[PDB]
Amino acid sequence: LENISSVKVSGGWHKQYTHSAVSTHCTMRFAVFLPPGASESNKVPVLYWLSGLTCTDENFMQKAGAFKKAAELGIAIVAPDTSPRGDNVPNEDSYDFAQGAGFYVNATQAPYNTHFNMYDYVVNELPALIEQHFPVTSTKAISGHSMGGHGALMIALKNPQDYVSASAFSPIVNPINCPWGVKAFTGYLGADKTTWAQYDSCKLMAKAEQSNYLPMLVSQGDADNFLDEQLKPQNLVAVAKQKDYPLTLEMQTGYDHSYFFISSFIDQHLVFHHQYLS
Amino acid sequence: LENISSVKVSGGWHKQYTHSAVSTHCTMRFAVFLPPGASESNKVPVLYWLSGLTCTDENFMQKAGAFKKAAELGIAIVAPDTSPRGDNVPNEDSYDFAQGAGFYVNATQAPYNTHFNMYDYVVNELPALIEQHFPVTSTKAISGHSMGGHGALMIALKNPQDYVSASAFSPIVNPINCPWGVKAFTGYLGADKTTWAQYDSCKLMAKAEQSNYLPMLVSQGDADNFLDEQLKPQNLVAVAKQKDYPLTLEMQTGYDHSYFFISSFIDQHLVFHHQYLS
Ligand SMILES: [Cl-]
Ligand SMILES: [Cl-]
Numbered sequence: 360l361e362n363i364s365s366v367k368v369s370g371g372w373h374k375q376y377t378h379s380a381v382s383t384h385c386t387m388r389f390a391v392f393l394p395p396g397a398s399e400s401n402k403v404p405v406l407y408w409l410s411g412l413t414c415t416d417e418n419f420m421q422k423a424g425a426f427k428k429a430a431e432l433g434i435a436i437v438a439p440d441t442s443p444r445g446d447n448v449p450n451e452d453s454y455d456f457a458q459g460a461g462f463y464v465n466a467t468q469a470p471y472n473t474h475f476n477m478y479d480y481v482v483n484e485l486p487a488l489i490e491q492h493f494p495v496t497s498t499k500a501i502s503g504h505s506m507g508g509h510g511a512l513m514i515a516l517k518n519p520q521d522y523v524s525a526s527a528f529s530p531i532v533n534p535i536n537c538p539w540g541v542k543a544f545t546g547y548l549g550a551d552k553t554t555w556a557q558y559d560s561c562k563l564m565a566k567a568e569q570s571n572y573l574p575m576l577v578s579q580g581d582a583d584n585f586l587d588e589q590l591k592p593q594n595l596v597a598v599a600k601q602k603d604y605p606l607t608l609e610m611q612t613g614y615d616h617s618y619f620f621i622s623s624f625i626d627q628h629l630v631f632h633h634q635y636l637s
Numbered sequence: 638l639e640n641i642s643s644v645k646v647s648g649g650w651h652k653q654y655t656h657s658a659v660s661t662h663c664t665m666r667f668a669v670f671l672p673p674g675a676s677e678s679n680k681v682p683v684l685y686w687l688s689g690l691t692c693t694d695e696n697f698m699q700k701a702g703a704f705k706k707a708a709e710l711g712i713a714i715v716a717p718d719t720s721p722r723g724d725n726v727p728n729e730d731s732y733d734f735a736q737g738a739g740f741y742v743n744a745t746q747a748p749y750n751t752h753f754n755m756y757d758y759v760v761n762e763l764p765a766l767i768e769q770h771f772p773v774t775s776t777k778a779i780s781g782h783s784m785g786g787h788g789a790l791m792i793a794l795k796n797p798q799d800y801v802s803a804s805a806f807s808p809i810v811n812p813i814n815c816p817w818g819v820k821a822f823t824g825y826l827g828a829d830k831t832t833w834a835q836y837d838s839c840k841l842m843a844k845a846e847q848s849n850y851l852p853m854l855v856s857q858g859d860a861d862n863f864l865d866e867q868l869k870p871q872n873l874v875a876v877a878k879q880k881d882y883p884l885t886l887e888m889q890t891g892y893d894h895s896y897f898f899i900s901s902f903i904d905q906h907l908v909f910h911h912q913y914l915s
């Protein structure tokens with residue numbers, strides 16, 4: 360665990376770290392924001408933020424503008440990378456697959472089975488590292504964008520007792536039924552689509568147990584050029600209304616898929632999570 | 638004038654444009670944020686933002702997080718480039734000179750005198766263009782960071798009656814007495830140091846007329862690596878005191894030279910300028 364950068368922002372501190380990840384079998388870099396006053400005697404809750412295709416930890420920390428409200432609500436923020444990295448990790452030219460595009464699953468197909476275990480990384484390895492080295496409690500929530508939105512809602516659904524709430528921006532709610540997901544699932548999981556269902560939010564919500572329901576918020580711009588071919592938000596809503604799941608999906612008129620969009624409603628999400636984090 | 642990008646943010650709109658600039662004799666790109674409600678029948682005041690070395694219009698728009706408060710206060714933001722651009726425009730690898738480093742002056746030394754007229758650009762051409770194609774009024778304020786901070790205070794002091802207020806983040810207040818200024822002024826203005834004074838905030842403030850005094854706010858992080866070698870805020874504090882100039886310079890403990898610092902207090906500056914812009 361090595362601190363590679365540190366900067367003050369909104370009374371708090373933004374810091375990047377690197378560490379030899381066991382789940383990804385490679386060096387991983389993640390960013391952490393500690394609100395003002397966070398200490399071993401005053402531990403704070405945590406919001407995990409998963410980014411989308413081609414992103415790293417820096418995109419959100421630099422363009423979301425989440426610090427102001429996070430400092431105010433006393434919420435720490437951990438932003439992990441989107442995949443394993445390095446010349447010893449497989450990769451291909453496409454931006455929508457392999458490095459920079461882990462889809463937060465545990466690849467079973469070789470050669471991706473070795474390092475592409477972003478699921479275990481985000482769900483087990485990182486949280487353990489965070490709670491052991493930072494002034495934070497075990498109370499946590501999760502959110503993300505696009506591929507990361509898919510990750511947040513999917514991970515929440517699969518770990519109902521470990522997250523108090525979940526949200527997402529422009530999420531890929533039904534990977535099984537979109538090019539990005541089909542490609543990602545085929546390469547990482549194989550052609551047996553029955554193994555895909557365990558990583559699809561729509562499939563997961565449908566089989567969800569009422570007692571494990573948890574507060575969910577989703578923001579989506581109706582000017583998102585990926586709205587119909589990859590995102591398909593209505594697919595999740597339909598399932599949510601079948602299960603009476605506590606999901607709130609809001610279309611924001613005129614907004615797109617960029618961080619200008621994320622920054623426009625990140626505060627709504629922080630307030631949303633704060634309610635359950637505390 | 639050609640619009641090259643458009644995105645919605647905080648209810649308003651962020652847009653980038655290019656045009657054939659006369660002053661710089663080259664195509665120039667700038668960005669504009671119109672708060673929600675801005676229209677021909679409802680025009681709004683403008684805050685010009687001057688960026689520092691190596692920056693363009695995007696750094697501030699993407700990393701400052703100024704839209705929430707600007708949209709709330711009804712303030713339009715114009716962020717021009719930092720110098721002329723193009724393969725036919727003089728340039729060199731140095732990050733502190735030539736392109737991305739116009740220092741907001743009108744170059745007198747060839748070959749720079751042809752395109753390096755950022756003073757003329759930001760002060761005369763740009764405002765005329767903005768007020769001609771956008772739902773903005775004539776009321777304006779100006780701010781900036783580092784080289785842009787130098788630009789903001791300098792431009793305001795040189796045109797006391799055309800700007801209602803001025804502010805800056807980590808400004809180069811005394812370019813004549815720092816490496817960045819010496820190098821830039823020597824290349825752009827020549828060896829005769831007497832021609833540099835007209836672009837130095839400390840020299841300028843020293844000769845300000847009482848009735849032309851205007852509100853000024855400067856924010857400087859005390860952990861800024863360029864503080865003592867390039868910025869020297871106290872040099873300006875001294876002049877301001879001798880002239881009873883209404884300058885308030887605050888040292889922000891623990892903050893650096895980055896946009897993390899800027900994003901931390903941009904709201905304070907917006908509120909600052911709002912008072913005079915309305
Ligand atoms: Cl692998
Ligand atoms: Cl030139």
